[PDB]
Amino acid sequence: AQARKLVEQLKMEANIDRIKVSKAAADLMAYCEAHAKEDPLLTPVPASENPFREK
Amino acid sequence: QLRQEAEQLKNQIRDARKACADATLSQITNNIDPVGRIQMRTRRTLRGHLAKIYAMHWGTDSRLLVSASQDGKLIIWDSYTTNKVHAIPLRSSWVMTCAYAPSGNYVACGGLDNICSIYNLKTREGNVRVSRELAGHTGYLSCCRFLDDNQIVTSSGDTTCALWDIETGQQTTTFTGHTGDVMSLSLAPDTRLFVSGACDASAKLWDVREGMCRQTFTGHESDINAICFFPNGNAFATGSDDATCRLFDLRADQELMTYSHDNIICGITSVSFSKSGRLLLAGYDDFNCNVWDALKADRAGVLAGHDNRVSCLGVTDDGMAVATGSWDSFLKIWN
Amino acid sequence: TLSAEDKAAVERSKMIDRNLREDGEKAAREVKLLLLGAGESGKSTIVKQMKIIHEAGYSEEECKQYKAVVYSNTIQSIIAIIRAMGRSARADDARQLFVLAGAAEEGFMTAELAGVIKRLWKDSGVQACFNRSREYQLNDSAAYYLNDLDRIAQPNYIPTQQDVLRTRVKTTGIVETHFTFKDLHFKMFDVGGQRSERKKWIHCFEGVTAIIFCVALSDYDLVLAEDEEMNRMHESMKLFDSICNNKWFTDTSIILFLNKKDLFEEKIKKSPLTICYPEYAGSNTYEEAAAYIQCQFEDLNKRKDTKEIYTHFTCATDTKNVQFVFDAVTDVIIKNNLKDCGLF
Amino acid sequence: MITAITIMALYSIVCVVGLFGNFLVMYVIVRYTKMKTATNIYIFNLALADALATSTLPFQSVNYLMGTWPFGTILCKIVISIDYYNMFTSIFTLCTMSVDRYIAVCHPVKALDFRTPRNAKIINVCNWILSSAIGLPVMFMATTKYRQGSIDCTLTFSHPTWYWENLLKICVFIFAFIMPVLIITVCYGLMILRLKSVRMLSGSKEKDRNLRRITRMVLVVVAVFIVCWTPIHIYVIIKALVTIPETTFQTVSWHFCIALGYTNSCLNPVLYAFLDENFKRCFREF
Ligand SMILES: CC(C)CCC[C@@H](C)[C@H]1CC[C@H]2[C@@H]3CC=C4C[C@@H](O)CC[C@]4(C)[C@H]3CC[C@]12C
Ligand SMILES: CC(C)CCC[C@@H](C)[C@H]1CC[C@H]2[C@@H]3CC=C4C[C@@H](O)CC[C@]4(C)[C@H]3CC[C@]12C
Ligand SMILES: Nc1nc2c(ncn2[C@@H]2O[C@H](COP(=O)(O)OP(O)(O)=S)[C@@H](O)[C@H]2O)c(=O)[nH]1
Ligand SMILES: C=CCN1CC[C@]23c4c5ccc(O)c4O[C@H]2C(=O)CC[C@@]3(O)[C@H]1C5
Helix, strand or coil, rough: CHHHHHHHHHHHHHHHCCCCCHHHHHHHHHHHHHCCCCCCCCCCCCCCCCCCCCC | CHHHHHHHHHHHHHHHHHCCCCCHHHHHCCCCCCCCCCCCEEEECCCCCCCCCCCCCCCCCCCCCEEECCCCEEEEEEEEEECCEEEEEEECCCEEEEECCCCCCCCEEEEEECCCEEEEEECCCCCCCCEEEEECCCCCEEEEEEECEEEEEEEECCCCCEECCCCEEEEEEEEECCCCCCCEEEEEECCCCEEEEEEECEEEEEEECCCCEEEEEEECCCCCCCEECCCCCEEEEEEECCEEEEEEEEECEEEEEEECCCCCCCCCEEEECCCCCCCEEEECCCCEEEEEEECCCCCCEECCCCCCCCEEEHHHHHHHCCEEEECCCCCEEEC | HHHHHHHHHHHHHHHHHHHHHHHHHHHHCEEEEECCCCCCCCHHHHHCCCCCCCCCCHHHHHHHHHHHHHHHHHHHHHHHHHHHHHCCCHHHHHHHHHHHHHHHHCCCCCCHHHHHHCCCCCCHHHHHHHHHHHHHHCCHHHHHHHHHHHHCCCCCCCCHHHHHHHHCCCCCCCCEEECCCCCCCCEECCCCCCCCCCCCCCCCHHHHEEEEEEEEEHHCCCCEEEEEEEECCHHHHHHHHHHHCCCCCCCCCCCCEEHHHHHHHHHHHHHHCCHHHHCCCCCCCCHHHHHHHHHHHHCCCCCCCCCEEEEEECCCCHHHHHHHHHHHHHHHHHCCCCHHCCCC | CCHHHHHHHHHHHHHHHHHHHHHHHHHHHHHHHCCCHHHHHHHHHHHHHHHHHHHHHHHHHHHHHHHHHHHHHHHHHHHHHHHHHHHHHHHHHHHHHHHHHHHHHHCCHHHHCCCHHHHHHHHHHHHHHHHHHHHHHHHCCCCCCEEEEEEEEECCCCCCCCHHHHHHHHHHHHHHHHHHHHHHHHHHHHHHHHHHHHHHCCHHHHHHHHHHHHHHHHHHHHHHHHHHHHHHHHHHHHHHCCCCCCCCHHHHHHHHHHHHHHHHHHHHHHCCCCCCHHHHHHHHHH
16 A cells, blocks of 8 residues: 555656756856845945944 | 565666766856855844744744744844844743744744644734644644745654645645655745655655655755755755755756765754855754855855854845854844 | 834833743743653553642633634634535525624624624524534534533633633643642653654753653563564663663653552562563562662663662552652752852 | 061062952953853852952051051041951852852752842842941041051041940951851851752762762861951950050061951952862863
8 A cells, every 4th residue: 555655656756857967057056146246145235235233 | 576666666766867967066166256255243142032942934024033942932033123022922832843924924833732833923902812723743843834824834743744724724735755754844935846854864845736746855864954945946955964965956856966074073953045045054063053155065154153053044035134043042143 | 213113112122021031030940850651651640640730820821812713713613514504594694604704804703703603593404514514524612612602702701711721722742731749840741642753852851850751560571562572671671771871861860660569569479570581580579579670770870970860669649759759859959059059 | 677578578469369369250250151140140249359358458568568658548448448348248248158058958949939140139239238338337437547656547436435446346246257157157067968968969989079079168168268267356356355565476466367367358269269160161161
């Protein structure tokens, strides 16, 4: 009962489409340097617009 | 019998994965400039807990977060002015999960009481009440996430995930298939998928709609303690106990990048991503968070200042903050 | 420069700070006991012989929370019975749709609750519909709420303490028992429900005052039903070994309760004592056998210079069992106060 | 000839060692360890009392060296006032620290809800207030007099000089000698008996070593306090009882009694903070 449903679950996980590692890593990197000028952690934003300042 | 059939077609699956690999992520990012060394300072220390913090979730308004500890208190903080907006007295002190709704109207918690409590933050009386308690699980509730105002997905100790409906209290969908205790789940940015990891050192992606596992990822060997989707939803990162964070993948279904070092042999409790996705922040058991480069697999900086083990972590939605809660009743927001 | 909004925010946060202050100072006076035990070791008897208070605590805060739970359960039950009606009685159906819309629009309690407790009891087919609804799984106390809620209609109704019990979901896992004994408060936890992996919630305690590890004495010659190859006292010993040699429990005191005493006295006379311990054959009496069991169970403390074990033999009534718990706890409190005073 | 030189040198060394020890204790208790536990508040206030008690020592040393008081009237008004203040603050914080340990041992259930930091704060506030409530009746009467062409500012009393003077003498004697020795011995003796009866310190070599170390470091506390405060009180009471001929021997004995009291004030941080195991834990981490 459990073994047959495990077999069919893992065999329907078998037949799915896969793109190459190069394409997925490439567009992950492309997403990385498409928002790089927006992320405040990578490039520290000026303290004038920073809402976390000493009072 | 059919055990050999399962073994040989699993052999077919990871043979297809091996044939699908032609270049690692190291070689495709071997020419980009690194982030170098980044320095982050604690602008806000959120004192007010008196016990061991275990969970933290930010808010969509990027200003209010919530954290839970072992004193039976669920404190909604303020990142801007350091103000305790709410502090709910919990009916179960043993909790290690807390969630914050995308609308900001609801907050969740759960733990060894097998109950996913939901609290209404904007009742007509002005205080915080209890709306619905989600019963049906037989194990400790490790991570819950709010899909919307109506649905919430939970990971339990009974090796099954569950999708709930708030006004009925019934699991509309059950996500079975884990041969081990699921400890963390992360919702997709498009709220159509979610991926969870378990003690069997495997991660599984599920469809919220049709309720069946699509992919499995067996990169880790110890367990899975944390998991977090990429901002675009095409990858995720996994924390574990063998001193390794692994960046898995969806459309290619392998282990892309290994974030491990030979001096940080402690475990990992928490992972999060920034807005750009280039900065994977991971909490560790050696009392400090490590900041990793999600493309170069090297440490950029260390978030010290916690004298006890870091337990929970989260990057805010607009990327301007990183809150780390740890086992010393304090939270720390960094820039 | 901050005005009324920030001033009110600061005042509210100060109030939260004070509330956390008294709550933490109250929780510091408690004593946390972690009650362990193997299969049918006798934890239920230990719990039930300390029957003083179990539902006592934050009674005012309890009754002011689950009102939304009550309203949501009532609206779920009425929409469930409306849906189970399908798949001369239309005016009340329109009334039920109206109270459905009112509950979707909150509406508090002034108008909708009076209508929903008035119109439901006028008809006679409601009981038949509820009986037909039992084919599928529904709320276990829907009609119970219906016939024990219509008697009161106050905006802040406090009928009984039983309402808090019936609305709150019973905890399958961690179990809380809070009793007091000689001006000191005890909070005992039963972890019998949690049966997945203890390695990921034993650290969730990490600092309880004492452990109440219970062992049945008469399981020395008994064997488990799981493959019929494991002795029950041997797995009790291995659980005690895992608890004693634990990184989270390295200095806490363990109070071993050897519970099945009269059954042990019955078993010694007809059964040999060499089944559990083949290397031991000293006597056949109750005293030496029980003492040898206790001695072979206390040497599992691999760090005897810091951790203390207080072993007691309890059988049936034993008012002095709680006294033994209190003595061990006050010894632990003395050690903690000496640690706090820079003496120990 | 050289008696003044050696007593000035001994005053100087006891003053600098006391000030350095109390400053180290204050530095550690502010920077390295915090002030959250009640005993930390107690040792902080003891450190302040000892540091402010020994800060008047250069004034008295140069008063003896120059044979006169060239510091005016208000300066020694506050010096004698702060000396009477500081002896009572240090003595009373020793008394309340011993009471604290006795409560933590013999009454554990009550010490759960009594040994809170705010309770220690209000006890210490009442301590310095009650020391001030008898140091301020000295503030309004100490003054500078002239005798034999030299300046001295011993405190001067009303028209019944002997009655008020001896009332002050017997009151400070009974309070700051009979009150601490009785309280300290009864509290520490009951604590040591209860530790002898308790399980965790008996029945093993390590446990008996721990119990013997606790008894040793309590008995050395009582012994150092009694020995260092014991010659000055009875010497003052026999100077007040019978007249004494003026000799070099009585001057050197008086100065050695003063030095022994200030040596207690100097050695309190050594046997009260450095011998605490929490401070040892803080020290071994760096
Ligand atoms: C300088 C001299 C002459 C004046 C008298 C000083 C008195 C008023 C001072 C000296 C030491 C002080 C205490 C030192 C430390 C603390 C801890 C703090 O968290 C609350 C106040 C409290 C308890 C202080 C109260 C006031 C105090 C007793
Ligand atoms: C209680 C024990 C431990 C110590 C007692 C010490 C005191 C009481 C002793 C020690 C040295 C003593 C002094 C030594 C010498 C002299 C000179 C003599 O012409 C008059 C008495 C006088 C001034 C003594 C007074 C009492 C004295 C101060
Ligand atoms: N004759 C006799 N019976 C005893 C004695 N003490 C306990 N029991 C029974 O032992 C079972 C343990 O069940 P329990 O619920 O604790 O199991 P658990 O580990 O899952 S919580 C209970 O039914 C008790 O009547 C005793 O002295 N004499
Ligand atoms: C060791 C120094 C403490 N001092 C406190 C005040 C005083 C003193 C001591 C003991 C008993 C007293 O009555 C008394 O008053 C004072 C006095 O007469 C000169 C000696 C002292 O400065 C000294 C010790």
